[PDB]
């Protein structure tokens, strides 16, 4: 079993798209009712959904926000009945400190819903927490909830899908530096597995490869939901191999301190058979997904670990010969002092496919330190003259001093230094 935690309007929209894609994959009616023909579905729908007392099926979802806007919008959406009303919370009525305060102030009901959903789940496997590290709501509240869940559930995994602020442009939120810094500090201290997303690269790929001039929020949500759906599908998709997320992730994490990933997947949202993919082959797809062009992120930096999941017909002999070809060209590189992996998964039996080969890659690259270097520089830039601190002075957590933020800065420094020295034996 597994649960989803959905924070901030970005998290809510991403989760809505995620459930949309999932219910499409499993042939579940938007209301939350299985389709006639799907009665024989072999794939384990119990992983996320579960039978209700009325024979319906509902996602093991959780929505949290301080603004009823997007939640009400969804509740008027065609898929509102998909959710359980009891699994939804709204505030009575942007800064990390404010989010921390609210998280402190509503701990009770939040854990009430969480453990109400957990206890029924016989064999839980972890937590996935999709959100953005820029919104004051998401930042502080997710920080607080991650910390508290770590305190309460030490034997449980936690997964996060962060949405880093754009580096291509002036950050979309003025005080975003502080929010991102604090949230990343908390994530490093507590988070188990991470999936870093930068809206900049999402926008870049959407423009370049989808051939759409205004894809934006809907299409980028399509892409991210597809990524998450592919991962969770290859998990749930029954098979004699790769039947536990813990095992999959452990293959990618030499130590907890390094538990940040780098994503990639062949873009196929638009039908556009002529324009999307004319031909496919495991060799060319694996080659593509190695390039930075297809990644969703913006010193001989190299890789630390790479995993790939493939779908459709595949010839393992072809797979290993392709890997040998890739090694011969030395297109990429692994850690010197170090000693990859690939798995094959099915597809949704009913969902049609406009190809025969596709793949999703997860990588851990030391080049990821660039984002943290940028953020550290930005935060020091803000601290130089100490502006935008008045809001935090209003906050008890920062009413006295700011040692929390300073220690977060030094923790980030240690993390970046460890990443740097990782390549060096």
């Amino acid at each position: 079993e597994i649960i989803t935690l959905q924070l901030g309007q970005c998290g809510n929209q991403i989760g809505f798209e995620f459930w949309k894609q999932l219910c499409a994959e499993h042939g579940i009616s938007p209301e939350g009712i299985v389709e006639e023909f799907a009665t024989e579905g072999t794939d384990r729908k119990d992983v996320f959904f579960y039978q209700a007392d009325d024979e319906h099926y509902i996602p093991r979802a959780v929505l949290l926000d301080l603004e009823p806007r997007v939640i009400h919008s969804i509740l008027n959406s065609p898929y509102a009945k998909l959710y359980n009303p009891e699994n939804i919370y709204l505030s009575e009525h942007n800064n990390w400190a404010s989010g921390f305060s609210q998280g402190e102030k509503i701990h009770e009901d939040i854990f009430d819903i969480i453990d109400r959903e957990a206890d029924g789940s016989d064999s839980l496997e972890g937590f996935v927490l999709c959100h953005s590290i820029a919104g004051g709501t998401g930042s502080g509240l997710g920080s607080y909830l991650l910390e508290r869940l770590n305190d309460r559930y030490p034997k449980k995994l936690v997964q996060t899908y962060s949405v880093f602020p754009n580096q291509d442009e002036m950050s979309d939120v003025v005080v975003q530096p502080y929010n991102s810094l604090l949230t990343l500090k908390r994530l490093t201290q507590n988070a188990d597995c991470v999936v870093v997303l930068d809206n900049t690269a999402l926008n870049r790929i959407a423009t370049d490869r989808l051939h759409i001039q205004n894809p934006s929020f809907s299409q980028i949500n399509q892409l991210v939901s597809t990524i998450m759906s592919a991962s969770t599908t290859t998990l749930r998709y029954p098979g004699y191999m790769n039947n536990d997320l813990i095992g999959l992730i452990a293959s990618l994490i030499p130590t907890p301190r390094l538990h940040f990933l780098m994503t990639g997947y062949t873009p196929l949202t638009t039908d556009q058979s002529v324009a999307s993919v004319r031909k496919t082959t495991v060799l060319d797809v694996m080659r593509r997904l190695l390039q930075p062009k297809n990644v969703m992120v913006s010193t001989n930096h190299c890789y630390i670990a790479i995993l790939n999941i493939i779908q459709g017909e595949v010839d393992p002999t072809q797979v290993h010969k392709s890997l040998q070809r890739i090694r011969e060209r030395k297109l990429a590189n692994f850690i010197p002092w170090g000693p990859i992996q690939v798995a094959l998964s099915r597809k949704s039996p009913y969902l049609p496919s406009a190809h025969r080969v596709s793949g999703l890659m997860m990588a851990n690259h030391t080049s990821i330190s660039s984002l943290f270097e940028r953020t550290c520089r930005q935060y020091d830039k803000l601290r130089k003259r100490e502006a935008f601190l008045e809001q935090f002075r209003k906050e008890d957590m920062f009413k006295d001093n700011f040692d929390e933020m300073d220690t977060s800065r030094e923790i980030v420094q240690q993390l970046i230094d460890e990443y740097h020295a990782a390549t060096r034996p």
Binding site: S98, V174, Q378, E390
Partner: protein, 419 residues
């Protein structure tokens, strides 16, 4: 769930324009019966009848009386309406301010999710300035942990309706700088120039100008009054734009403005619209933007805008060097989007538009405007002209000295932030 308050004749007329535009947005008849978003600023009693959280004020009952008999006579609550800076604050304002606060609380307690108040006032009108000072002071004392935003009319550098504008401006600023959380100065002369250049009008009249101002106010409040893929609220406005408590006087702007005839003959390229927002001529205050650095900026789009297009447009604006920021803040945009587009008021000044943006930013040229005001005040203090119109109101020359040195300190702080 936020309320609004209007002061001075300027505030009264601006509120009129804002409320008529709103009811057009939600299709509410003058009575208040339509043929969620609606409650965001309106209140529905037991019956379907709706009412806005509106309260005005004015010493002279002419405007209040006419609006009572005005076209929107049947909309507002009869009690919702309420009938020399020192006079505006001390000798007169103190008398009735308590009733105003009574009504204000009676409105607020009814609401549940309160966040702040919208302050609509001027800077020259002595009665308006003084009453606004007293009102916001009392509100802050009793309602400290809540937002408070000014949308005033900074005196134009060249055209002054009255003669004692510096007195009112300096008094209100010295009293309110600490408390006014974030103020949006808007100079009328900018409205004159932009309307002449874009709307293609010959005689600007306060009605048209106030219609435009309400248009910008609707633009800023749209991100609340409707859904959006990138929403925002008052706390965001008063946090992102406050590098320091003292420097919270961002400017205004509304680029897409064209007559129905000029509505066609173009595409409204969002990149072009944003550049227009940043064009020094199109700016909405007579303060050279090119002299001062855009310390902080905020953009609240509405209509059919798209994150990809805004990203490309803002990057294109970035590549131009003519716009420069402070060397210590590399990230200072507060982007904002909303699906609903602006609604053209029938027979109004503007024409139909699908994409609309409302820029807002803080610069340093406002320091030059402050210095101009201070120089005019130096002249006014040189002759000590007609100060006897204030001496008997309970104030003192020491008040003048402290307020003047306060303005000087504010200018010095702006200078520091510049370097």
């Amino acid at each position: 769930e936020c309320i609004s308050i209007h002061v001075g004749q300027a505030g009264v007329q601006i509120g009129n324009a804002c409320w008529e535009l709103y009811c057009l947005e939600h299709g509410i008849q003058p009575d208040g019966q339509m043929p969620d978003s609606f409650n965001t600023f309106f209140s529905e009693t037991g019956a379907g009848k709706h009412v806005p959280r509106a309260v005005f004020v004015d010493l002279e009952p002419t405007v209040i009386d006419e609006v009572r008999t005005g076209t929107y006579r049947q909309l507002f609550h009869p009690e919702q309406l309420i009938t020399n800076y020192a006079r505006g604050h001390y000798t007169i304002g103190k008398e009735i301010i308590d009733l105003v606060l009574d009504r204000i609380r009676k409105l607020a307690d009814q609401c549940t999710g309160l966040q702040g108040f919208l302050v609509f006032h001027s800077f020259g009108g002595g009665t308006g300035s003084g009453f606004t000072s007293l009102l916001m002071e009392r509100l802050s004392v009793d309602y400290g942990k809540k937002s408070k935003l000014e949308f005033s009319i900074y005196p134009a550098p060249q055209v002054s309706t009255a003669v004692v504008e510096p007195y009112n401006s300096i008094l209100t600023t010295h009293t309110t700088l600490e408390h006014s959380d974030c103020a949006f100065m808007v100079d009328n002369e900018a409205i004159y120039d932009i309307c002449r250049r874009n709307l293609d009008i010959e005689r600007p009249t306060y009605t048209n100008l106030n219609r435009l101002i309400s248009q910008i106010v609707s633009s800023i409040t749209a991100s609340l009054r409707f859904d959006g893929a990138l929403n925002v609220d008052l706390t965001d406005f008063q946090t992102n734009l406050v590098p320091y408590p003292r420097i919270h006087f961002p400017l205004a702007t509304y680029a897409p403005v064209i007559s129905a005839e000029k509505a066609y003959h173009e595409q409204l390229s969002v990149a072009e619209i944003t550049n227009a927002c940043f064009e020094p001529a199109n700016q909405m205050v007579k303060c050279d933007p090119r002299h001062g650095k855009y310390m902080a900026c905020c953009l609240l789009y509405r209509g059919d805008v798209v994150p990809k297009d805004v990203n490309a447009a803002i990057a294109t604006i970035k590549t131009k060097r003519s716009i420069q920021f402070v060397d210590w803040c590399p990230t200072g945009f507060k982007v904002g989007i909303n699906y609903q587009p602006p609604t053209v008021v029938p027979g109004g000044d503007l024409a139909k538009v699908q994409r609309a943006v409302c820029m807002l930013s803080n610069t340093t040229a406002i320091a030059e405007a402050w210095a101009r005001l201070d120089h005019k005040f130096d002249l006014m203090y040189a002759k000590r002209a007609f100060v006897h119109w204030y001496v008997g109101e309970g104030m003192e020359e020491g008040e003048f000295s402290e307020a003047r040195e306060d303005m000087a300190a504010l200018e010095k702080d702006y200078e520091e932030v510049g370097v």
